Amino acid sequence: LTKVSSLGYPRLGENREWKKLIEAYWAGKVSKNDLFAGAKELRLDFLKKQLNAGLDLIPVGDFSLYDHILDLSVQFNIIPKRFAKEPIDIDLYFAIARGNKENVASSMKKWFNTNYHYIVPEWSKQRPKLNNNRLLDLYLEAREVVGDKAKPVITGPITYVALSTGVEDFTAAVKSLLPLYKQVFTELVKAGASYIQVDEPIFVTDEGKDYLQAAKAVYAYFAKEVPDAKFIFQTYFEGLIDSQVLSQLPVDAFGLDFVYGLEENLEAIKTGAFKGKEIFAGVIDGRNIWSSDFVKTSALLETIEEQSAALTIQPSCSLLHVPVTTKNETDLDPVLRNGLAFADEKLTEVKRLAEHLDGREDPAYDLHIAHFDALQAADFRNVKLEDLSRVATKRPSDFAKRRDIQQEKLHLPLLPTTTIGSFPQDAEYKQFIQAEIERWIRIQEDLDLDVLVHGEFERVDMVEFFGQKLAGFTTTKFGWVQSYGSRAVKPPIIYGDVQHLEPITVEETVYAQSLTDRPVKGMLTGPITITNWSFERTDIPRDQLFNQIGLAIKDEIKLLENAGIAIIQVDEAALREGLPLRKSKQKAYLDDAVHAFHIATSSVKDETQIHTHMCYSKFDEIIDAIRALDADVISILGIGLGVYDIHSPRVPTKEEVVANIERPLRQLSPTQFWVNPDCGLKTRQEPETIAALKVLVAATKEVRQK
């Protein structure tokens, strides 16, 4: 009798029908009737998949035409001031999300530590009120398909306000929303709702410690106002903060993440603090694509059941964070595919975990373990890699000594100018790329940049480009995951031991270098970004994976250096998403990244300059780690200076760029700086780009003069 559930489901559809539908609507090629009709068709198909998988409580409410937080902003009347005069309908919804002819769109931010982005609410002087019956309509629609199995879901008020901007008083804002949620819940109960999922993930974060009292007040309010609702205080992405305190909230059930919050939540459980509450145990990884370790998971569930009043099994977080199904992934090896589980396969896993716990006899249980075991015994997870005790983890000469040697060989001027790597964008294709590479080499020479790059025109993704040629990686045909709005990504999968077996970037880099006398940089991607953007294995620890990747990078760097490349750069763009949520776990992560960086870059000659670019904001908390890297230069102790916002079609002026470059020279010796644009340039336009790079050179040459 162990119930099975889920927090949410992807919106894309098996073939990204959702993406095509809303984009077509925006392009004026799909009418409102067909937009809503096509969306309804998708919703009914999703409900049926969850019904057929055996779920007892099927989530309803997370489907959206863009973002679930934006849904609440329109529903609760938290509409940006500039949009206040627009009729409240689907066109306003999209205007806020994408902007229109007269107003810019609302900004987006990462959803906790995932690769999903939500639309940030902009509070002003507007008074909250319900502008529609969004959730009630979805619930009643769901009931027709699944009956009493329908479980309304919604993001809670505390989390909603915490993820907003423009709020001067937190408690006031939360309070103003309570009556709206009250009505929403009351109407759902009247329509037949029992269990209601209220997402409050802010309570797995460090920031959450400031809202413990708000939770007590808010949920005590809901409990008294809506007595018949069985609220599930839903959390995910880490352990429940202050479990002893929050365990006494007046709710019938708590959703705890046992995949990303195992140690912490298991401790809370063992204290008996939840002996009188129902636990919705997230035991299936809702953010990765590996079939579950049933023996491990079932043992955990027995422990959870013995320490709770009741238990419901579900994934760790909404399935919104993984692709739809392995069903049509025909190019994959059978041993691998049988060990994979996307959204639809995870619905099946939860059902089977509950059947096993209840003593039901199901052949699929042990068969699942058999396939899992086959994957673990696979030859591709038992590859003999290079012996790390024979790989340098520290360069033979310190920075000071390397600085001079490199200066004598490169003879670079004061405040050298360069770019980050990308520009705007069988034999036929290669010569097409080379022609473009040369065209931009001349463009760079004509602008007089000191250190050049080939453009990365042959690359569409800084991670897929490497995964394509590395052993241990594979790509899927349809494994798409929504990133933001109608944009989706198809992450590569690191399924086995990573190994470098062939040159990846040598050809184009050497080609570019053969066309100029100026030094040309090599361009590689680091382990932080490769692991974060990819669906990494979960059968080996993080440090082992980072190190394998470090070894592969080292191998590529050896090929570049042998080919005569004097400068090699290691790119890291995902530190913001990779750094653990919890402050207390960040040092261990950084330590692993630093070690892998040493493995990758400690085997070069002293004359070879090692650069690293890290898209980040505040290095104050991670300064000792940056130093530990011992990189000759790091674009943002040699340090590169970004002074051109590449994320905007705006062309800077000499007067502005000159200020940007001079500010940092106020302290440290000017003999450690370089000048270049911020993270990337691939999303820019040629005219704007070239004109902007021209002002950069002129501005720098002027500062040298000074």
UniProtKB/Swiss-Prot annotation:
<dbReference type="Pfam" id="PF08267">
    <property type="entry name" value="Meth_synt_1"/>
</dbReference>
<keyword id="KW-0677">Repeat</keyword>
<dbReference type="InterPro" id="IPR006276">
    <property type="entry name" value="Cobalamin-indep_Met_synthase"/>
</dbReference>
<feature type="active site" description="Proton donor">
    <location>
        <position position="647"/>
    </location>
</feature>
<feature type="binding site">
    <location>
        <position position="533"/>
    </location>
    <ligand>
        <name>5-methyltetrahydropteroyltri-L-glutamate</name>
    </ligand>
</feature>
<feature type="binding site">
    <location>
        <position position="615"/>
    </location>
    <ligand>
        <name>Zn(2+)</name>
    </ligand>
</feature>
<keyword id="KW-0808">Transferase</keyword>
<comment type="similarity">
    <text>Belongs to the vitamin-B12 independent methionine synthase family.</text>
</comment>
<dbReference type="Pfam" id="PF01717">
    <property type="entry name" value="Meth_synt_2"/>
</dbReference>
<dbReference type="GO" id="GO:0008270">
    <property type="term" value="F:zinc ion binding"/>
</dbReference>
<feature type="binding site">
    <location>
        <position position="679"/>
    </location>
    <ligand>
        <name>Zn(2+)</name>
    </ligand>
</feature>
<dbReference type="GO" id="GO:0071266">
    <property type="term" value="P:'de novo' L-methionine biosynthetic process"/>
</dbReference>
<feature type="binding site">
    <location>
        <position position="456"/>
    </location>
    <ligand>
        <name>L-methionine</name>
    </ligand>
</feature>
<feature type="binding site">
    <location>
        <begin position="420"/>
        <end position="422"/>
    </location>
    <ligand>
        <name>L-homocysteine</name>
    </ligand>
</feature>
<keyword id="KW-0479">Metal-binding</keyword>
<feature type="binding site">
    <location>
        <position position="461"/>
    </location>
    <ligand>
        <name>5-methyltetrahydropteroyltri-L-glutamate</name>
    </ligand>
</feature>
<dbReference type="InterPro" id="IPR013215">
    <property type="entry name" value="Cbl-indep_Met_Synth_N"/>
</dbReference>
<feature type="binding site">
    <location>
        <position position="484"/>
    </location>
    <ligand>
        <name>5-methyltetrahydropteroyltri-L-glutamate</name>
    </ligand>
</feature>
<feature type="binding site">
    <location>
        <position position="456"/>
    </location>
    <ligand>
        <name>L-homocysteine</name>
    </ligand>
</feature>
<keyword id="KW-0489">Methyltransferase</keyword>
<protein>
    <recommendedName>
        <fullName>5-methyltetrahydropteroyltriglutamate--homocysteine methyltransferase</fullName>
        <ecNumber>2.1.1.14</ecNumber>
    </recommendedName>
</protein>
<comment type="pathway">
    <text>Amino-acid biosynthesis; L-methionine biosynthesis via de novo pathway; L-methionine from L-homocysteine (MetE route): step 1/1.</text>
</comment>
<feature type="binding site">
    <location>
        <position position="571"/>
    </location>
    <ligand>
        <name>L-homocysteine</name>
    </ligand>
</feature>
<dbReference type="InterPro" id="IPR038071">
    <property type="entry name" value="UROD/MetE-like_sf"/>
</dbReference>
<comment type="function">
    <text>Catalyzes the transfer of a methyl group from 5-methyltetrahydrofolate to homocysteine resulting in methionine formation.</text>
</comment>
<feature type="binding site">
    <location>
        <position position="613"/>
    </location>
    <ligand>
        <name>Zn(2+)</name>
    </ligand>
</feature>
<feature type="binding site">
    <location>
        <begin position="420"/>
        <end position="422"/>
    </location>
    <ligand>
        <name>L-methionine</name>
    </ligand>
</feature>
<dbReference type="GO" id="GO:0032259">
    <property type="term" value="P:methylation"/>
</dbReference>
<feature type="binding site">
    <location>
        <position position="115"/>
    </location>
    <ligand>
        <name>5-methyltetrahydropteroyltri-L-glutamate</name>
    </ligand>
</feature>
<feature type="binding site">
    <location>
        <begin position="487"/>
        <end position="488"/>
    </location>
    <ligand>
        <name>5-methyltetrahydropteroyltri-L-glutamate</name>
    </ligand>
</feature>
<keyword id="KW-0028">Amino-acid biosynthesis</keyword>
<keyword id="KW-0486">Methionine biosynthesis</keyword>
<feature type="binding site">
    <location>
        <position position="571"/>
    </location>
    <ligand>
        <name>L-methionine</name>
    </ligand>
</feature>
<dbReference type="GO" id="GO:0003871">
    <property type="term" value="F:5-methyltetrahydropteroyltriglutamate-homocysteine S-methyltransferase activity"/>
</dbReference>
<feature type="binding site">
    <location>
        <position position="19"/>
    </location>
    <ligand>
        <name>5-methyltetrahydropteroyltri-L-glutamate</name>
    </ligand>
</feature>
<keyword id="KW-0862">Zinc</keyword>
<dbReference type="InterPro" id="IPR002629">
    <property type="entry name" value="Met_Synth_C/arc"/>
</dbReference>
